[PDB]
Design a binder for these strands. Structure first.
Length: 159
DNA sequence: CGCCGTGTCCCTCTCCCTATAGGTTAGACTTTAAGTCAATAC
């Protein structure tokens, strides 16, 4: 499922390159580790191929995913619990889960808030984190040059 | 059965974010004490 040279997508660190299919044994059991590295954190992670789907290493958003998160970002009628703390903990869990639809919903919701209401620097920071991981996801999904991913993302938020 | 000396030991002294309500100050307007000039008389 995850061969060498594959630009495979791992949560939460986005896309990553696999270097080799490592045969590092433990307890005399030659498990099929794979070395995978990302470009942001500059870290290398070894994952066994058996429980590779347990960690949920995904595949990059294609076209249906792009228009799906598009429709979510343009989805109207979204409203939140009145107490800001419930909204905060809900969308914190929602970003911690890390799926593209819910990250898109988080960023579009907070952008709709930020347009008029405004949020705290911590809440701006939570946005900025979700926006950063989302624009990395899109810029390696359409393979479209992070700066241009930011400019298209700003194009689409206005609708 | 009922109280008293000796010994040992412990201790002390010295050399997050939100919402409401209320107080504070800074900033400008009109008044006043203040600085000024011109002519004059002895």
């Amino acid at each position: 499922i995850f061969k060498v040279g594959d630009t495979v997508v791992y949560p939460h660190h986005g896309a990553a390159l696999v270097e080799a299919i490592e045969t590092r044994t433990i307890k005399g059991e030659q498990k099929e580790y794979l070395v995978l590295k990302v470009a942001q954190g500059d870290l290398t992670v070894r994952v066994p191929a058996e429980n590779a789907e347990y960690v949920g290493v995904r595949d990059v958003v294609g076209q249906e995913g792009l228009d799906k998160v598009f429709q979510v970002l343009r989805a109207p009628h979204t409203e939140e619990p009145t107490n800001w703390s419930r909204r905060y903990k809900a969308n914190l869990e929602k970003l911690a889960s890390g799926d593209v639809n819910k990250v898109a919903e988080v960023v579009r919701d907070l952008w709709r808030r930020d347009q008029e209401r405004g949020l705290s620097a911590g809440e701006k920071r939570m946005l900025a984190k979700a926006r950063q991981i989302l624009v990395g996801e899109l810029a390696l999904a359409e393979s479209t040059d992070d700066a241009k991913a930011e400019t298209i993302l700003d194009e689409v938020l206005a609708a």
